[PDB]
Design a protein around this nucleic acid. Structure first.
Length: 168
RNA sequence: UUUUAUUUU
């Protein structure tokens, strides 16, 4: 069974030692790593926790996924095997009709492959979608297929062409 | 252009 977890949405000032200690409450941790920028040294707000046992990893997901830490809500999920293929697979999308929900956006992009995570940005003044979304695919080839299919194109029921590009 | 930050040799 799987033992290795990726932990996203860590507080900016959380240390590797703090990550390890937090997750050690569940069971015996084989290793924990906080990912930091190579050039300047700041946390990138995500890390990996590898448990000795698969039951502990599973319990950690059920217990700690969604845990509030400072102003963050952490995500705890199984890490996919580390590989070049999974990197840079994150899309920025704009021009979406404001009536599209997160699920609607996911429904629209799911044909291209497995979706890792997604977000539709909301205007906090009005509560309405900004028509801007993020969608990360399992593999960069999947995101590329989405770009070529959708970028510059109007969704059915909308007169507005959308932009689909790699995020950043 | 995200809860700025999803693969650590």
């Amino acid at each position: 069974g799987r033992t290795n977890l990726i932990v996203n949405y860590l507080p900016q000032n959380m240390t590797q030692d703090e990550l390890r200690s937090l997750f050690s409450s569940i069971g015996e941790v084989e290793s924990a790593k906080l990912i930091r920028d190579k050039v300047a040294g700041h946390s990138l707000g995500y890390g990996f926790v590898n448990y000795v046992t698969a039951k502990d990893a599973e319990r950690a997901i059920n217990t700690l996924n969604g845990l509030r830490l400072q102003s963050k809500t952490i995500k705890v999920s199984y890490a996919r095997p580390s590989s070049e293929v999974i990197k840079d697979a994150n899309l920025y999308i704009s021009g979406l009709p404001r009536t599209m929900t997160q699920k609607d956006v996911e429904d629209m992009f799911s044909r291209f492959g497995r979706i890792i995570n997604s977000r539709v940005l909301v205007d906090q003044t009005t509560g309405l979608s900004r028509g801007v979304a993020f969608i990360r695919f399992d593999k960069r080839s999947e995101a590329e297929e989405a770009i070529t299919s959708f970028n510059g194109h109007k969704p059915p029921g909308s007169s507005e062409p959308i932009t689909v590009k790699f995020a950043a």
